[PDB]
């Protein structure tokens, strides 16, 4: 019956600031704290800090002093984390979670309920739609290369969703330009290369790009 | 703050017992909490107050103490137990500390060698001044794989990027793409394009190649 719901994805330029919200339901918000934890891509959980609303006290990890502000709004039962002076290495998933201080036994608690996470991405790249190129040749492989786009995400289907077995769409890689590329491939019988048509459907909503590409032997 | 030490990785065979330790000189006085984080999900609290299991966590999970060390034991490990496990504690002033996280791999016994495919650049990309050459590894397990690019029999370095799926949902295997990016000018200066693949399932490294033109 407890839920923490966070605000959506943020794409920010270096030097900007970001605010993330965390909306509580199902408990008496003013008797628990809110904790924020950060996770850079491929890395571990990093404590940011906590805020307790019944005394407005906050504790931040030293590295965030002067750059992070947590607040709570007891009138909307919402917690906020603001991070200022963003740098590329602030790119991370930011979680809110519920903690408390047990006053009977005098100990700080674990984090029992978690928000779903807010991805904050920091870079100087600008929105750009992808170029879509064919990947053309027992079992045969074919695909589409979805190159030089920003920001995430892209969705890829094959034959408008009618082809799902053997499809592999790879996590995007960040290129040194700051743009992303990915490939999507499918394994098919070499028998079928002349008979069946293969089209990859690429959708990049941030740039209003929808491409169908026919991949031929 | 006091440190919490847990190993960066633990491997367990399916059905065997995994033990993940977490040590810190402050643990005799403070509770330990364990979080499980599966790929693409938020962390979930699986042990709290050192010995308590929330309702809904499998009875396979238990936690014991011994000195300054706490051990999370995963009995009869299941494929769904593959995840990162973080231990966590706090001091009496409210500073929270996480360990580095232990990647627990439930390491299947099956060794599946990759299928290897290579893709020349499209004429369409070539018109734009760039050549991306793509090497695909499909349906392999375990995840450890080495892919080397050779252009005119010369090993490349610095000009390729790799990507691996998470484990395929149906086959529980991996696929991997390696992309070599050159200018059209450099691409046309060479003839033989090859990717050489090493994996536990391959007796000796295998090479897929094509000749430009």
């Amino acid at each position: 019956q407890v839920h923490l719901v966070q605000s959506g994805v943020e794409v920010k330029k270096p030097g900007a600031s970001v605010r993330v919200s965390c909306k509580a339901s199902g408990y008496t918000f003013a008797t628990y704290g809110i904790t924020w934890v950060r996770q850079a891509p491929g890395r571990g959980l990093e404590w940011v800090g906590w805020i307790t609303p019944y005394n407005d006290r906050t504790s931040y990890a030293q590295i965030f002093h002067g750059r992070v502000t947590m607040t709570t709004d007891t009138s909307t039962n919402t917690a906020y984390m603001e991070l200022r002076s963003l740098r590329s290495d602030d790119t991370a998933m930011y979680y809110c979670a519920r903690n408390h201080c047990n006053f009977y036994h005098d100990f700080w608690s674990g984090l029992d309920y978690w928000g779903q996470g807010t991805l904050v991405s920091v870079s100087s790249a600008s929105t750009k739609g992808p170029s879509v190129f064919p990947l053309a040749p027992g079992t045969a492989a074919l695909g589409c290369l979805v190159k030089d786009y920003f920001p995430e995400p892209v969705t890829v289907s094959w034959n408008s969703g009618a082809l799902t077995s053997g499809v592999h769409t790879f996590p995007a890689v960040l290129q040194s330009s700051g743009l992303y590329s990915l490939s999507s491939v499918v394994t098919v019988p070499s028998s079928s290369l002349g008979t069946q048509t293969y089209i990859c459907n690429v959708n990049h909503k941030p740039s209003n790009t929808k491409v169908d590409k026919k991949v031929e032997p | 703050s006091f440190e919490l030490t847990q190993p960066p990785s633990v491997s367990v065979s399916p059905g065997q017992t995994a033990r993940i330790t977490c040590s810190g000189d402050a643990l005799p006085k403070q509770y330990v909490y364990w979080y499980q984080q599966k790929p693409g999900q938020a962390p979930v609290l699986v042990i709290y107050k050192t010995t308590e299991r929330p309702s809904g966590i499998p009875e396979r999970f238990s936690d014991s103490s011994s000195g300054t060390t706490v051990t999370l034991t995963i009995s009869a490990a299941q494929a769904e137990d593959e995840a990162d496990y973080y231990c966590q504690s706090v001091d009496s002033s409210g500073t929270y500390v996480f360990g580095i996280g232990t990647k627990v791999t439930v390491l299947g016994r099956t060794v599946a060698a990759p299928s290897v495919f290579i893709f020349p650049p499209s004429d369409e990309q070539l018109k734009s001044g760039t050549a991306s050459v793509v090497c695909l590894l499909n349906n392999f397990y375990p995840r450890e794989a080495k892919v080397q690019w050779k252009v005119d029999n010369a090993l490349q370095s610095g000009n390729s990027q790799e990507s691996v799926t998470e484990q395929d949902s149906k086959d529980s295997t991996y696929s991997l793409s390696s992309t070599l990016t050159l200018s059209k000018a450099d691409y046309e200066k060479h003839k033989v394009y090859a990717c050489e693949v090493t994996h536990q399932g391959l007796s000796s490294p295998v090479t897929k190649s094509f000749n430009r033109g």
Partner: peptide, 28 residues
């Protein structure tokens, strides 16, 4: 007296000072 996974944590009124939020939810 544990409040993990509960809906209301006990905050003693002795710590409330002049914080109105604290006084709204505290217990003696």
């Amino acid at each position: 007296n544990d409040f993990h996974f509960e809906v209301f944590n006990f905050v003693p009124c002795s710590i409330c000072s002049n914080n109105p939020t604290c006084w709204a939810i505290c217990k003696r």
